[PDB]
Structure formats: structure tokens, C-alpha cells
Amino acid sequence: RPRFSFSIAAREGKARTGTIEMKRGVIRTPAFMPVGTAATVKALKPETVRATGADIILGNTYHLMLRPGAERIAKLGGLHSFMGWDRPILTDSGGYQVMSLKQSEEGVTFKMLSPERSIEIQHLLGSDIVMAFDECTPYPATPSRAASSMERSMRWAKRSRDAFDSRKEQAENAALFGIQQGSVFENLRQQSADALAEIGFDGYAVGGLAVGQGQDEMFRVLDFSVPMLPDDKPHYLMGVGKPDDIVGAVERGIDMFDCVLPTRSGRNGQAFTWDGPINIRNARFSEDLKPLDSECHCAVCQKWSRAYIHHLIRAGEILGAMLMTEHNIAFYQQLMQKIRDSISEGRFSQFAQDFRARYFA
Amino acid sequence: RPRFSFSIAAREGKARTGTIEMKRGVIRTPAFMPVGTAATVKALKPETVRATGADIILGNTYHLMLRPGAERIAKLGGLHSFMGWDRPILTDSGGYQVMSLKQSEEGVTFKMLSPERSIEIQHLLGSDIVMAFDECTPYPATPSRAASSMERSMRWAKRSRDAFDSRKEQAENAALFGIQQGSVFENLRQQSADALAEIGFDGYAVGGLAVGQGQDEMFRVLDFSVPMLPDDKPHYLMGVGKPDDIVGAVERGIDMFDCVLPTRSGRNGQAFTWDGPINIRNARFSEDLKPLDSECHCAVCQKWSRAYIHHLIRAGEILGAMLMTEHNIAFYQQLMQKIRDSISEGRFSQFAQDFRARYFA
Numbered sequence A, B: 001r002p003r004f005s006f007s008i009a010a011r012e013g014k015a016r017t018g019t020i021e022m023k024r025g026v027i028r029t030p031a032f033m034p035v036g037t038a039a040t041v042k043a044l045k046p047e048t049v050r051a052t053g054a055d056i057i058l059g060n061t062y063h064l065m066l067r068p069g070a071e072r073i074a075k076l077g078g079l080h081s082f083m084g085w086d087r088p089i090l091t092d093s094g095g096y097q098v099m100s101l102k103q104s105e106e107g108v109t110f111k112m113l114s115p116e117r118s119i120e121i122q123h124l125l126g127s128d129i130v131m132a133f134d135e136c137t138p139y140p141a142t143p144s145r146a147a148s149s150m151e152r153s154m155r156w157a158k159r160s161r162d163a164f165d166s167r168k169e170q171a172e173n174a175a176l177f178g179i180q181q182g183s184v185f186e187n188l189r190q191q192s193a194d195a196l197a198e199i200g201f202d203g204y205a206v207g208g209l210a211v212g213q214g215q216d217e218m219f220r221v222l223d224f225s226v227p228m229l230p231d232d233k234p235h236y237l238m239g240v241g242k243p244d245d246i247v248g249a250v251e252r253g254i255d256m257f258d259c260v261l262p263t264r265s266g267r268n269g270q271a272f273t274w275d276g277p278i279n280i281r282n283a284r285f286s287e288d289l290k291p292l293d294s295e296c297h298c299a300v301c302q303k304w305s306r307a308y309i310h311h312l313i314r315a316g317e318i319l320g321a322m323l324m325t326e327h328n329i330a331f332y333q334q335l336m337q338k339i340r341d342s343i344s345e346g347r348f349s350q351f352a353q354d355f356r357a358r359y360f361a
Ligand SMILES: N#Cc1c[nH]c2nc(N)[nH]c(=O)c12
Pocket: A092, A093, A094, A095, A096, A131, A134, A135, A136, A137, A179, A206, A207, A208, A209, A210, A211, A238, A239
């Protein structure tokens, strides 16, 4: 397998379906990446993660650097060996969680991260897809602040590019994605896309659209932002999102997603269904013998009832988190397969319409 | 398969190995039963429980009656269908956890349980091995109080026997075990055994020896107590225990065990090894690439290191509980297999000696 090869097999409108080939395996696109923050996709064994259909998972620079430490993981063989996931891993660069969980042109010191250290940590972890180190931009933001932040990010993008390229082992075996910023302003988004395309990356994320924008605003910004990115490279929407956001984003040209919604909200009692989300803690399920979802092919829906999972979550039992999380990730993966299949057949616009009508019924 | 058939295949000293055949399956003896308190063996899927080697699990009358309710579980198909375990289940009678978690000759009311309601709840749950309803006796206890408590228990044992026998579906499909009491006093233990043997049960537990007795005192009481029980029926030591207690108990004639040690202490960081217990949270494991135990054939030891599991537990990650608990239960089951195998070959006394020397090295 190549270091990196993205190939588009089919298109419909702005939507695309294909694959990313990497040394550690193939990623079908559009793709959903389960989030694993402390070297684990919470409450799931790696094998379970794979069984739901995931091709790739996301790991977090900020968290692992803190615990258990990047150097320590490298010493122990790298993130893949450490956690038991032998397939691709995308690592975020850290500056996102640092901002959420001392800021200068050099990077940031908190209770150090720079483009150079970020790129090195990701290397130490053995990441397959390295994210450029950026300055996330709060929402809302004034144009001047958004401009300033965007410009820094483009300078940090160039620094990321060069630190990556300097490490022969990393450059020959991993990929590097740049991140577009500019808040919701078309001109800043154009400038950022141009700057990133001039540096040149293996893939392009759309950053800064998961920090409080509602779906309408997010879509209108994607509407103009994604066509500015090179067409022949993957387009990654960071931190998005709900099933309906994912469908509308793919309709706008996005190829990759991550989100903590299905794991996090799964442990909180929220289960995804084709008929929309349900809160399994609700008393209406105490004697409901139906599976979480009527059509889901996951092991959880094959074996246990709503009523059982209701009891487990109300009791704060670990198995409840386990089963909720397995279902929800399986659901996300099945949505992704239906999007892929429907674009491959020229019926994705019909699929998106049908999905919505049911999901919001 | 019969309702109930216990057959002894081999003996060595007081030790016995054989099987219990029941409609839902075969139980190899000596047996370890994982404890599942709120319709779950904590942090494990039923299939995982089975993969470790468990033939039978224990469910709790007191807990399920409270949440989710006995009648509710019956409505939903019974405990087996509800939780996804289709093999035998032993249910405790409830009066143990009631005493630990309004006492009269009729039973007990708390913030009602009588022999009759206990036996009915266990029926509602669909239990395979029903425990008589007893009055557990605190340790230490004066002879007079122990005598009084024991006598009540024998009256409650007779009431249990008759409530069970009255329910044709239960009597034709389940088994009933009586529980010996009498604290640590040989005369009271003799009286209780005689009384239980006169009523007649399918199996005999040794109750009241897991409420603070140290191993020396527990063994001396087993020394005289187990030969008082009918030889051709299973002997069950309730709430025991550590690996070394289990070995010494089998050397004294016990056939069945339950304990929360491997699940509970597993989620707390304690891992069992043939070299004795380890606390995986200890800093000495932060970069230890060895499996939890050098010889363990469990999936956990096949796949992950001490260092990883160290990180997960320190981080309070659910996967840490999952893997710790799977290992510990697998360990207990492997101990049980080595006891069974060694008695079948007339080398159990050598095995017990060898186990100890290493375990306590
Ligand atoms: N909005 C937002 C995102 C959620 N992940 C993010 N990751 C970095 N590295 N940049 C970001 O803009 C975002």
C-alpha cells in the first residue's frame, strides 16, 4: 500500500465516494472516525470498534501528551501497539483541547505546544494522519480577530509542513493535513484555502465550524468554503457531528468526520435510531422488548432489549455504557455505508431526503 | 438433561471432582461462579463470561427485587433472556444482602422478605439453583444467639423446602439447596446439618463463614462441618473467596464457590497472578510490557500489557475495568480447571502445595 493515495470512485453533485489507501490500511470515504481520547475508544475493545465498521480512529495529541506521555508511548512501541489498534490513526494537533480543556507566535504554554512539538508528539505516537497545528477561532469572532487567527494558523501550517518534511521516517510513512480557518467569513476562508493549497497537503480540514455554529450557519459556510479546497484531496470536517449534519456536510463535499457524540452521548443514555435519537433512561422503555433500533445489524441490537439497556444505564452499570456505545458507533458506521452506497449508485440526493423525513418524523 | 444430577468422577482425600447436570447445562466441579448483582457480571458481556470458562453464574435476590423488580423480569421473559445468559444461574435468597446492605419469625421487612417471597422471587427470575432463605449469623456470635439464629434458619429451611415443592414448575425444573449455619460451633453445625439432611435438599451450602473469619478459623470449622453434610450432594461455600481459600476449601470437601473478589477487586486495580496478587496502579508497571500474568491464556493477557492496563485504570477508563475483570475471572476459572484436573489425576495435594509455595513466594 502507498503512504497515501486518495481515489474518487463516484460522484453526485458535490458529494464524493472513494478510498484512502495508507500503509496501515484502506479508509472508505465518506468516513466516520470514532474518537479515542486516552488511548481508548471509551468502553470498547479495539476489535469491537473494528467490528462496527470503523476503518480509522482519531487519537488526541493534547491528552496523551499529558497522560501517559508521548515519549513513554514511543518507548512502549507507539500508540498502535499500546492500545491494540493496528489500523490507521488520525491524531489531532492539540491546540483545540488546549483552548478548551499562554498564547504567542511560538505556540502555547499551558497547565508547551508549538507546531514543532505537536508534529513531534504525533510522530512519537506513530500517527498515520498528522494534523497541522492551528489556532482554533472562537465563535462568534470579529473579522479582525478571525483574520489575525487565521493568518497565524497559516504561518503555523507552513511550520507544521516543514517539521513533518524534516523527519524522514514521518514524511515517508505518514500523511499531513492542513486546516482551514477564517471563522464564517468567505474572504478569510478563501485566503486560508489559497495559503494551504500553496503549501500543499495530503488532505484539507475545515476547522472552526464546531464551536457553537448552528447547522444553518455551518452549512452556509461549507457552501462556499469546500469548493475553495483542492478537489482531488480529502475534505475533513472536524468535530462534526450529528447524523443530519453528516448528511448535509457530505452533500457539500466533505469526506471525513469525527465527533464524540456517539460515544459520549451513548454513555449518557442517548441512542441513535433511523427514527431519530431516543433517551433510553426514559420510563417508556422499562418494559420495551424491542432492540434499540428496528433495523440495526449490530450485535447489541441482535442480543439485548431496550428494557435491559434501560435498566443497566439507570443502574450506572458499565455494561450499559459498553452496549450503548457499541450500538451508537455501529449506527454511525451504517449511516456512512448507506451514504457511500447511495453516492456509488447516483441516488444519494434521494437518500438524504428520505433519511431526513424519517429521522425527523 | 435431568433437572439435577451430581456425579463424582474422582476423589483425593476429602476432595472431589465431577459434574452437575441441569436442564440449562453442565457445571464442572469444583466450580467458581462469577457474581452478577444487577443482572450483569460487571463490565462483562455474557459471552465474555462464558469464554473465561464459567459454567454458571450467581444472581442476587435482594438486588433484582429492588431494581428492576422480580415481577418485571418475569414479564420480560426471566433473568436468562433479560441479561443474555442462557446457562445455569444460582440465585442467593436475599437475607444476606438485606442484613448487610425489621426481623421476625415471619421474615424481614426493610427499606418484605420471608422464605415464601424469596422462593417466589427466585422463581420469577427463572433461577436454576434456588437458595433456601436463611438468617445469616454475624461473626463473632455468642453460642446462644448462634443457636437461636441457626434454629430459625432450620425452620426457615423447612418453609423454603415446602414453598419450592408447592410450585410444580419450579420443583420440576430447578434445584433447591439448604444452608448450614451455627457460626463456628461444632455442636450447632451438627444440629444444622442433621436438620437439613432430614428435610432433604439437592445441595448443601456452608453459610456464615465469610463474615469476618480469618482463613485459619474458617478452615478449622470446615474441617468438622463438611463431613457432617451428605457426601453424595454438592457442598457449597458461600462468599469464599481468595485463590488460597478456594484451594484449602476444596481440600476440605467443598465443590462450589462464589465471591465478588475477582470482579470487584479487578475494577479496583488488583490483578491475580500465580505469583500472587498485584496492584496494577503501582508505578512499577507504568512501562511494564509483560501481560498481567506470565502464563494466563486469557484474551487480555494475549493482547495487552500491564503498562496499558496501568494507564487505563489510572485514568478511570471503562476499558480498564473491562480488561481487569476479564483477566481476573479467567484466572479464577483456570485455577478451578487446574484443581479439577489435579484431583482427576490423584495429584491435587501436590498441586495445592506447589500453588501455595509460588503464590506466596
Ligand atoms: N471547530 C473545531 C474543531 C473541532 N476539532 C478541531 N481541531 C483543530 N485542530 N482545529 C479545530 O478548528 C477543530
